[PDB]
């Protein structure tokens, strides 16, 4: 999240992120596998 | 300062014996902070 990547993934202009940029983006940082990418899927707000 | 012009030059690593280096960075901090941004910053293209 610190990172800038992230950022760059980032668009909305009042913060947030859509779930599908938050898979991508975590995706593209290559540190996650799928199951943990998914974890963090469920473990996060996930405002409608 | 100084060094920052040579980044993005086609002949960054010449009087050195490895003309790999360009791609070494590439590989190793180009999924974190970006790897389009290290293809700008190191003048690379990731087609050719």
């Known amino acids: 999240?610190?990172?800038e990547a992230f950022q760059d993934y980032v668009t909305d202009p009042r913060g947030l992120i859509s779930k599908k940029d938050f898979q991508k983006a975590m995706?593209?940082?290559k540190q996650f596998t799928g199951p943990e990418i998914q974890?963090?899927?469920?473990?996060s707000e996930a405002d409608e | 300062?100084?060094?920052?012009?040579?980044?993005?030059?086609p002949s960054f690593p010449s009087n050195?014996?490895?003309?790999?280096?360009?791609?070494?960075?590439?590989?190793?901090?180009?999924?974190?902070?970006?790897?389009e941004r290290i293809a700008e910053l190191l003048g690379m293209?990731?087609?050719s």
């Open chain 1, 27 to 29: 995706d593209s940082q």
């Open chain 2, 1 to 9: 300062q100084w060094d920052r012009l040579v980044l993005n030059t």
């Open chain 1, 39 to 43: 974890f963090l899927l469920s473990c």
């Open chain 1, 1 to 3: 999240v610190g990172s």
């Open chain 2, 45 to 47: 293209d990731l087609a």
């Open chain 2, 16 to 35: 050195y014996w490895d003309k790999f280096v360009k791609r070494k960075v590439l590989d190793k901090h180009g999924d974190i902070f970006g790897r």
